[PDB]
Every structure is written in structure tokens, then in C-alpha cells.
Structure 1
Amino acid sequence: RRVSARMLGDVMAVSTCVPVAADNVIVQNSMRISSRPGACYSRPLVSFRY
């Protein structure tokens, strides 16, 4: 099942993720960081509701 993990050394931990419908998610028209010129996010931003 879809889960998130992080190395706990030689073993891994796991947490169950909650699903979200597609209609409850939207991508912004731009990524631009007006507060810091020269810095750009590597992935697009999003806004959603559970």
C-alpha cells in the first residue's frame, strides 16, 4: 500500500498515507518566487483540501 518511509538505520519505518481526490487538487499557473530572484523550485506548487 502507498506509504512513506525514512531510513531508521538498517531498518525502515512506515506511515500510511491518506488519499485525496483529483478534483480537490489544483496546480498554480506559475512557480516564480517573487521574494527571492534567482531561486526556483524544482517541482510545481499545489493547493488542496482533504
Structure 2
Amino acid sequence: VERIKTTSSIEFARLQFTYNHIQRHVNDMLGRVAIAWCELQNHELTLWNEARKLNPNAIASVTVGRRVSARMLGDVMAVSTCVPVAADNVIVQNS
């Protein structure tokens, strides 16, 4: 047999309840946001497939990271890095 000692402050329990409620709700909402983001990307892969067939240059450049020149060999993209040219060294012909 024994005797049970009770703490005189319950604020640990109420704090636990508050934190648990907030954690559960925020985790739920963020899980939904993450799942929606995942589905959106898996969903827009189709737009990206059907845009690269219009002009592969822009899609390939924005995708790889560099500024590359690309073409399509069927179901793949063949790329090649583009060489920079200084701004001041261009002439536009008048006509």
C-alpha cells in the first residue's frame, strides 16, 4: 500500500492539451497542403510534357538551370550549353 502525492499546479496538463490540439491541427493542415502540392506537381507534369514540344529551348533552360539549347529526339531532350555574349557587342541592322 502507498499514498499518492498530487502536484499543486495543473498547468502542465493544460499546456499539454493546448500544445496537442495545436500540433494535431497544424500537422493535419500541413499534411493536406503537402499532399495537394504533390498532386499538383504530378498533375502539371502533363502541361510540362506538352509545352516542351512547342519550343524545347525555354523549357530545357528553365528546367536544367543554365541557359541551354535543346531539341527533342523522340521522347528525350538533347541539350547543349549556350555561350554568353557581351551586351555592348551587338548591332541591330536598320531594315
- Indicate the TM-score class for this superposition, using the shorter chain for normalisation: 0.5 to 0.7
TM-score by length of 1: 0.57
Q: Which runs of 4+ in 1 moved over 3 A?
A: none
Identity within the alignment, %: 100
Q: CA deviation at 1:11?
A: 0.4
TM-score by length of 2: 0.31
Higher RCO (CA-CA < 8 Å; seq separation 6+) = 1
Report the RMSD for the aligned CA atoms in angstroms.
Answer: 0.5
Aligned length: 30
Q: CA deviation at 1:14?
A: 0.3
The one of 18, 24, 33 aligned to 2:83: 18
Mark the runs of 5 or more structure 1 residues left unpaired by the alignment: 31-50
- More strand as a share of residues: 1
Mark the runs of 5 or more structure 2 residues left unpaired by the alignment: 1-65
